[PDB]
């Protein structure tokens, strides 16, 4: 299925390559100017919106999630690209206008592929199937990461479905953060 | 199908985002120290090996394809990653130990997802199906790029299937280059 392949692609072509090196990058940042602040958490927080809406700025999604810093970028030779670069961004989570947590955080971009395929008629992908494909993407990624030696206790899947309109993305992440 | 999704992912999540900006990056490089050399071609050359073997160094694949330079990297905010970086590499193609062409060149990494899925039993993907999925990936990508407004005359798909062992990847690319 589409989402089956997208989840394997997300692991094979991305997470398997950055997760083995994430813990060291995070420690280098925490050991850096950051002297008086709380340490960045050790896991990649991956936002999995089941509506497949992947905006490019998280502060648009919630002004309680504000960008703090970029992690030291990782480079590797990949598929003929010398020094292919992996950047990741650090966000602070605000709770009543005070810092309640700090983590590397991003959206699972393959969900945007499902969104776009549902928009383009040439994809032969129905809007009405997108929700179940997004759930299947998340379930498959969970299945993979449970057994994968790279992704062992250094990412956190945050899946959610917005209503009512009363939704706090920051509270979703904070729920997962403080359970460690 | 798996490869259907992978081809839409490759376009939506990558090619649609770098191709609109490639021509300007290539011109900036050609207008740069490069004063006496031939200009880099205007298209992204995408290697599509139907055996799904995506090595990380092209000089391993053929010593007649040798790395020349990195293009000026492109950055954009993406899915919560500030200044997500797209690097691409420039290769020269040798013919009888003289430069016969110069182009931006890389492998279509989603083919490596098919390769890996055929290797991992949890993917439920048979080795015997990989060849037809790789062909379907290429066919779908061609179908997409024909209609896509981004990818109009700025990439070149190089699909091939090695035997005999007598195969020249450099000659494949040079065939496509000199037809412009
Ligand atoms: C084969 C695949 S899936 C996938 N998903 C997210 N990726 C990222 S983060 C933000 C982005 O998509 O640009 N960087 N590479 C990937 C990537 C790759 C390279
Ligand atoms: C969603 C997808 S597919 C895909 N295919 C190749 N991509 C590249 S080149 C080399 C690489 O894979 O790392 N950079 N991003 C991608 C990419 C992304 C971000």
Swiss-Prot record, chains A, B:
Region named Cyclic dinucleotide-binding domain (CBD): 1-180
Cross-link annotation Glycyl lysine isopeptide (Lys-Gly) (interchain with G-Cter in ubiquitin), location: 82
Q: Name one GO biological process term.
A: cGAS/STING signaling pathway
Where's it found, cell-wise? Endoplasmic reticulum membrane; Cytoplasm, Perinuclear region; Endoplasmic reticulum-Golgi intermediate compartment membrane; Golgi apparatus membrane
The effect of residue 5 to E is: Abolished homodimerization and activation
Gene Ontology MF term list: 2',3'-cyclic GMP-AMP binding; cyclic-di-GMP binding; DNA-binding transcription factor binding; identical protein binding; protein homodimerization activity; protein kinase binding; protein serine/threonine kinase binding; proton channel activity
Positions on the Cytoplasmic side per record topology: 1-180
Binding residue positions for 3',3'-c-di-GMP: 9, 14, 84-87, 109
Q: Specify the effect of residue 113 to A.
A: Strong decrease in c-di-GMP-binding
* Post-translational note: Phosphorylation by TBK1 leads to activation and production of IFN-beta. The phosphorylated pLxIS motif constitutes an IRF3-binding motif, leading to recruitment of the transcription factor IRF3 to induce type-I interferons and other cytokines. The phosphorylated pLxIS motif facilitates SENP2 recruitment during late phase of viral infection. Phosphorylated on tyrosine residues upon MHC-II aggregation. Ubiquitinated.
Q: Altering residue 13 to S: what's the impact?
A: Slight decrease in c-di-GMP-binding
Q: Give the recorded effect for residue 88 to A.
A: Strong decrease in c-di-GMP and cGAMP-binding
Give the domain note: In absence of cGAMP, the transmembrane and cytoplasmic regions interact to form an integrated, domain-swapped dimeric assembly. In absence of cyclic nucleotide (c-di-GMP or cGAMP), the protein is autoinhibited by an intramolecular interaction between the cyclic dinucleotide-binding domain (CBD) and the C-terminal tail (CTT). Following cGAMP-binding, the cyclic dinucleotide-binding domain (CBD) is closed, leading to a 180 degrees rotation of the CBD domain relative to the transmembrane domain. The pLxIS motif constitutes an IRF3-binding motif: following phosphorylation by TBK1, the phosphorylated pLxIS motif of STING1 recruits IRF3. IRF3 is then phosphorylated and activated by TBK1 to induce type-I interferons and other cytokines.
Q: Member of which family?
A: Belongs to the STING family.
Q: What else is known?
A: The cGAS-STING signaling pathway drives sterile inflammation leading to type I interferon immunopathology in severe COVID-19 disease caused by SARS-CoV-2 virus infection. Tissue damages in the lung and skin lesions are caused by activation of the cGAS-STING signaling leading to aberrant inflammation. Endothelial cell damage is also caused by activation of the cGAS-STING pathway: SARS-CoV-2 infection triggers mitochondrial DNA release into the cytosol.
Q: Which disease is it linked to?
A: STING-associated vasculopathy, infantile-onset: An autoinflammatory disease characterized by early-onset systemic inflammation and cutaneous vasculopathy, resulting in severe skin lesions. Violaceous, scaling lesions of fingers, toes, nose, cheeks and ears progress to acral necrosis in most of the patients. Some patients have severe interstitial lung disease.
Q: What is this protein called?
A: Stimulator of interferon genes protein
Tell me what organism the protein belongs to.
Homo sapiens (Human)
Gene responsible for this protein: STING1
List the range of the whole protein covered here. 154 to 336 of 379
